[PDB]
Amino acid sequence: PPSHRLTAKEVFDNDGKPRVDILKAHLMKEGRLEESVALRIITEGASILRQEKNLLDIDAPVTVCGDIHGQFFDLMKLFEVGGSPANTRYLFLGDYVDRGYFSIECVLYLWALKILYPKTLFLLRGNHECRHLTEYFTFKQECKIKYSERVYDACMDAFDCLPLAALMNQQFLCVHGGLSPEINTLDDIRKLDRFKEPPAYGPMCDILWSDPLEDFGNEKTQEHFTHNTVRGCSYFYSYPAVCEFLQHNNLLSILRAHEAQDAGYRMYRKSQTTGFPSLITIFSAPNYLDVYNNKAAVLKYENNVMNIRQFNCSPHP
Ligand SMILES: [Zn+2]
C-alpha cells in the first residue's frame, strides 16, 4: 500500500473529469488521496446530487445494485459482473458505508464515477447515509484515521443530497427500505424535503428503514403496517399494503435492498393481478461481514428481460 497520496492533477484531468482507472488502481492498493483531493470529489459530487430529484426517473436498461457496506473490493468485482460504467447504466440503493473497512474508498470511488457519468450512473440514499449510524458504526472513525473529520463532515452533507427513490422504466419503484403509511402516491415522495439528517419518524425515515413482514405474503390478518421491532423503528409492511400501492400507482414491483439475502436476492409473493413478484430484495455485499458466506447479486433489467447476476467474494493478497 503506497505512502504516496494522490494529487489533484494525478486524479483529475484538466477538464475536471476524474481518471477513474488510475483512481481505482491506487485505492485497491489501499492508497489514500490528498485530503484536498478527497474533499473536491465529495463536494463536486454533492453539487450534482443536490440538483437531482427526490425521486429520479430512469429509463432502462440498467443494472440495479444493493448494499455495499464498505466492501470496496467486492464493489470492484460488482462492476466487472455488471459492466463498465462507461457503457453501463447503474442504480445503487444505498448503504455504501460502515461495517466494511473500505467505506471511504467506496464513497470516493462512487462519487468519482458520478462526476464522470452524471447521467449514466445513479445513487440512492441508504439508511447508513446519516450522522447517527456512521457515528455508531465505523465510518466516522475511519475518516478520522485515514483522512479527517472534515472529510467525514463533507460526506454527511453530501449524503443529505442523495435522492431517496427512483422510478425505473415507469414500472418499478426502487427504494432502499420500502413503503410508508404516509406515502400513498409517487407525488408524495416528490414533496418530501430530503436535504437533511433522516428523522426518527416519518415518511423519509420509512423509505430508508421499512421491511416486509417476516411472513410477508402469508400473513395472519390483513395487517398493513406494524412497528418494526427488528429495527426498533419505522414499520413492517405487508403483501396487501404493497399490492395496494402497486395497483394505485400503476406499478409492477418495489425493488429494494436493506434486508440481506443468502442468494444475493429474494423474490417475494406474486401480485395477484400482474403475475409478477410484488417485491424484490437485492443485496450486493458478498460474504457479508466475513461471516455470512453469502452470494451477492445485482439486477439487470434490459430489453424487457430481467436477469439476475449473482457473484462471490473477491480476495486480497
Ligand atoms: Zn439498510
Numbering used by the authors: 24 to 340
Would you copy out the relevant sentences from the publication that reported this structure?
Calcineurin (CN), ubiquitously expressed and highly conserved from yeast to humans, plays a critical role coupling Ca2+ signals to different gene expression patterns and cellular responses. CNA is organized as an N-terminal catalytic domain, of about three hundred residues, and a C-terminal regulatory domain comprising the CNB and the calmodulin binding regions followed by an autoinhibitory domain (AID) that, under specific conditions, binds into the active site blocking the access of substrates.
The structure of the catalytic domain of human CNAα (residues 2–347) has been determined from hexagonal crystals. The two subunits of the catalytic domain contained in the asymmetric unit presenting important structural differences. The first subunit in the crystal shows the essentially invariant conformation (herein referred to as trans-CNA) found in all available structures of CN and other PPP phosphatases. Residue Pro309 within the SAPNY sequence is a peptidyl trans isomer in trans-CNA, while it is a cis isomer in cis-CNA. The thirteen residues long connection (Phe306-Lys318) joining strands β12 and β13 in trans-CNA is reduced to a standard VIa-1 β-turn with only four residues SAP309N in cis-CNA. Strand β13 presents a ten residue shift between the two conformations with Asn310 in cis-CNA being structurally equivalent to Ala320 in trans-CNA. The decrease in the number of residues for the β12-β13 connection together with the amino acid sequence changes in strand β13, can explain the destabilization of loop 6 and of strand β11 that in cis-CNA are disordered from Ala283 until Arg289. Instead, in cis-CNA the acidic and C-terminal binding grooves merge into a continuous surface, due to the reduction of loop 7 and the flexibility of loop 6, rendering the catalytic metal ions accessible to substrates with wider binding surfaces than for trans-CNA.
